[PDB]
Each structure stands twice: as structure tokens, then as C-alpha cells.
DNA sequence: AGATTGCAGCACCTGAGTTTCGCGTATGGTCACCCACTACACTACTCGGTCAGGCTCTTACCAGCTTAACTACAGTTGATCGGACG
């Protein structure tokens, strides 16, 4: 895989000056300046569904760090991008919309009908230690 | 009534119709081995983004002046706007 990407598919080289760069990111920045079109805003947001464009690389660095920070779900630690990403993923845990089933983390048999009732099993066969966070998190 | 002779009865070697058999030749059947394909979960090296380090370029200068434009003061006229008409 490395041989193909270093002897035949020269993807890390400039299309114009024939320098090369240690990551595609720096090649992109290089093309955006040293071989740039007459465009006023040489930088464009690299992320999903974002259409914004910028004059100086520092403003793009700021925009990525502000509006596309890479987060982990507070409950399930799965990664997501930006405020919308977190708010979209938080629906999955929501007990008002997602009228989910109720089970033990270990015991195969459980089949509760309400959240308060599920805490009886975790309060007796387990205890207040090693209950799952989605059950515990009365955060709203 | 004897010398010549046939009948036919005895016994033992022999022959086929009939049978049981052995094998060929070949066929369906047991079952043991090991192969091919598939696949859930995994191993591990690379690529990639991000960050620092610190060497690097390039700015534009102080008050004044002296080369260059605006940036406020200013006046009659627009035609959206309110709110009420059709
Ligand atoms: Zn180049
Ligand atoms: Zn963006
Ligand atoms: Zn979550
Ligand atoms: Zn249990």
C-alpha cells in the first residue's frame, strides 16, 4: 500500500511546482496560495454541509475550531461534529420521544414497563454502582 | 442226448441330465479423509489531522512634510410607506 502511494500514485506532489508535502492537508493549503486563482477567498470550509469561505487560513482554523469542534456524546462517548451533531445524537437517548425498552446490562430475562421499576433490578441484583449512564442520567 | 447254441440272469464300470457351485466382471453401497468455500471477529501497519518547535520572511515605522484623496458642513427633490380606500 505504501509502495503504490510512494512510487506510482504521486498524490502528495504539487500539480504545478512539483514540490511534495507530508500530508494532503498541507498540499491543499499550498495549492490555495502558491498556485491560487484570482479569487478573493482562497479558503473553503472542509466539512459536511458547510458552505462558508474565508480570506486568511487563520479565519478557517477559527471557523473549524468554533463551529465544527469534534465532540464525544456525554452519555455514550461516540464522536460527533459540532453543536448540531450533539443535538441530533441526543435524540437517541431521549426517553420522551424514544419510548425505549427496559433491560438489565447482564441478566438476560428482564422486561420492565417503566423507568422507576427498572431501577429495582439495578437496586437489588446490582447496586447504585455499575448501572448504565443512560438510565442514571436525569440531566434535563 | 449229446454238441451246438440262445435266453437272460448275475455283477460293476460309466455315462448323461441335473444340480450346486466359484469365479469374472461388473455394479450399487457402506464410510472414512480431507478438501473448498464461507464468515465473524481480529490483528497491525499505514495514512491522516493536529500540534509544537524555531527558523524564516515581511512589515512600516515617530513627530513632520509633502505627495496623494476624501469627509464633513451643505439644498430640492424622490417614491416607500402608513392605513385606509376599492
Ligand atoms: Zn506547487
Ligand atoms: Zn464550516
Ligand atoms: Zn450518546
Ligand atoms: Zn440483571
Swiss-Prot record:
Highest rank taxon of the organism: Eukaryota
Transmembrane segments: none
Residues of the signal peptide: none
Localization, UniProt: Nucleus
Chain intervals annotated as zinc finger (C2H2-type): 12-35, 43-68, 71-93, 102-126
Further comment found in the protein's record: Present with 1380 molecules/cell in log phase SD medium.
Function according to Swiss-Prot or TrEMBL: Interacts with the internal control region (ICR) of approximately 50 bases within the 5S RNA genes, is required for correct transcription of these genes by RNA polymerase III. Also binds the transcribed 5S RNA's.
Protein name: Transcription factor IIIA
The gene coding this protein: PZF1
Residue span relative to the full protein: 152 to 291 of 429
Amino acid at each position: 500500500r505504501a509502495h503504490i502511494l510512494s512510487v506510482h500514485l504521486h498524490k502528495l506532489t504539487c500539480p504545478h511546482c512539483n514540490k511534495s508535502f507530508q500530508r494532503p492537508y498541507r498540499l491543499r493549503n499550498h495549492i490555495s496560495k502558491h498556485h491560487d486563482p484570482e479569487v478573493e477567498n482562497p479558503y473553503q470550509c472542509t466539512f459536511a454541509g458547510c458552505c462558508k469561505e474565508f480570506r486568511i487560513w487563520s479565519q478557517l482554523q477559527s471557523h473549524i475550531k468554533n463551529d465544527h469542534p469534534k465532540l464525544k456524546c456525554p452519555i455514550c462517548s461516540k464522536p460527533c461534529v459540532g453543536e448540531n451533531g450533539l443535538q441530533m445524537h441526543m435524540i437517541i437517548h431521549d426517553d420522551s420521544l424514544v419510548t425505549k425498552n427496559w433491560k438489565c446490562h447482564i441478566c438476560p430475562d428482564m422486561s420492565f414497563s417503566r423507568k422507576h421499576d427498572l431501577l429495582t433490578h439495578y437496586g437489588s441484583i446490582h447496586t447504585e454502582e455499575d448501572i448504565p449512564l443512560e438510565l442514571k442520567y436525569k440531566i434535563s
